[PDB]
Design an enzyme around this catalytic site. Sequence first.
Site, PDB file in Angstrom:
ATOM      1  N   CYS A 205       0.875  -1.065   0.021  1.00 23.28           N
ATOM      2  CA  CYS A 205       0.083  -0.116  -0.182  1.00 23.28           C
ATOM      3  C   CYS A 205       0.910   1.101   0.014  1.00 23.28           C
ATOM      4  O   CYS A 205       1.639   1.293  -1.006  1.00 23.28           O
ATOM      5  CB  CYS A 205      -1.071  -0.003   1.090  1.00 23.28           C
ATOM      6  SG  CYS A 205      -0.251  -0.575   2.715  1.00 23.28           S
ATOM      7  N   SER A 206       0.883   2.143   0.851  1.00 26.25           N
ATOM      8  CA  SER A 206       1.635   3.185   0.968  1.00 26.25           C
ATOM      9  C   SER A 206       2.701   2.708   2.364  1.00 26.25           C
ATOM     10  O   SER A 206       4.175   2.864   2.103  1.00 26.25           O
ATOM     11  CB  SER A 206       1.310   4.668   1.504  1.00 26.25           C
ATOM     12  OG  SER A 206       1.955   5.685   1.392  1.00 26.25           O
ATOM     13  N   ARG A 211      -3.462  -1.360   4.908  1.00 23.66           N
ATOM     14  CA  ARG A 211      -4.243  -2.354   3.919  1.00 23.66           C
ATOM     15  C   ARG A 211      -3.579  -3.641   3.720  1.00 23.66           C
ATOM     16  O   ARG A 211      -4.245  -4.793   3.331  1.00 23.66           O
ATOM     17  CB  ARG A 211      -4.609  -1.251   2.530  1.00 23.66           C
ATOM     18  CG  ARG A 211      -5.490  -0.087   3.045  1.00 23.66           C
ATOM     19  CD  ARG A 211      -5.693   0.778   1.836  1.00 23.66           C
ATOM     20  NE  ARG A 211      -4.645   1.647   1.937  1.00 23.66           N
ATOM     21  CZ  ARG A 211      -4.198   2.627   0.917  1.00 23.66           C
ATOM     22  NH1 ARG A 211      -5.296   2.715  -0.225  1.00 23.66           N
ATOM     23  NH2 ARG A 211      -3.122   3.701   1.086  1.00 23.66           N
TER      24      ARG A 211
END
Length: 279
Positions: A205-206, A211
């Site tokens: 994700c980031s 997530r």
Amino acid sequence: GFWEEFESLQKQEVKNLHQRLEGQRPENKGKNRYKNILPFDHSRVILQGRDSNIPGSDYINANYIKNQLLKTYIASQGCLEATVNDFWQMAWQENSRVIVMTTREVEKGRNKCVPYWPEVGMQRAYGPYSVTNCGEHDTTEYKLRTLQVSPLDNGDLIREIWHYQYLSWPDHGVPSEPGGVLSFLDQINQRQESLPHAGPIIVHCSAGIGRTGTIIVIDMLMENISTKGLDCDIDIQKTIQMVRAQRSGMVQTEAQYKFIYVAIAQFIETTKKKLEVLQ
């Protein structure tokens, strides 16, 4: 004599299971999105093809994750411009054939991940690898890009890598219904299962814990159910703890935690209804 002495040394590594020193080298400062979100040394992905004479050259913010209560995964942070080449080295060396991106590049005006694929029909180098985007397919919730990758020193050695990007799951919330994520994971699993020799699925994700952790836990639980049946002990708390021992902070938020339950409950109910039909 030997195994007892060996066990006495196994003790120290057990206590060291929480160290994150590699990510704190000054040379690696520009390779992390957050100074406090670092890979555990014991499970970090160590980049090959790098000069061990250059401190930090082997570094990427990513960890191997396996289901230690049952396929395997890598949980990675999303690329910075400074780490795109590092990402491709990781994918190549691990023989990964499926990449699962659970974020948009930018969300609500905040940078989450720089693109590390070319536009369709474009070929370009990322360090010593050539990557071509051979095509895309759009669904309502996600986009599939088919990438061809080869080493620049060995141009004919081509691997197809399937890149799945989920488009409707923000870092600040979870989807309203789990169906989109469940079918997304079904497609990913079909792809992965079709390649017995493929390496770990790379999921990011980031920051690579929220997530990313949520989707990996959902997948491991689905796997457990599909393997053992609906009779099996489903222990979400235990599964999360097990995944957190491998990368710190996996499954970050209360909304993510509840989403796991909602996703698995629907998976079980859908499975049960299909079995009822078959009986």
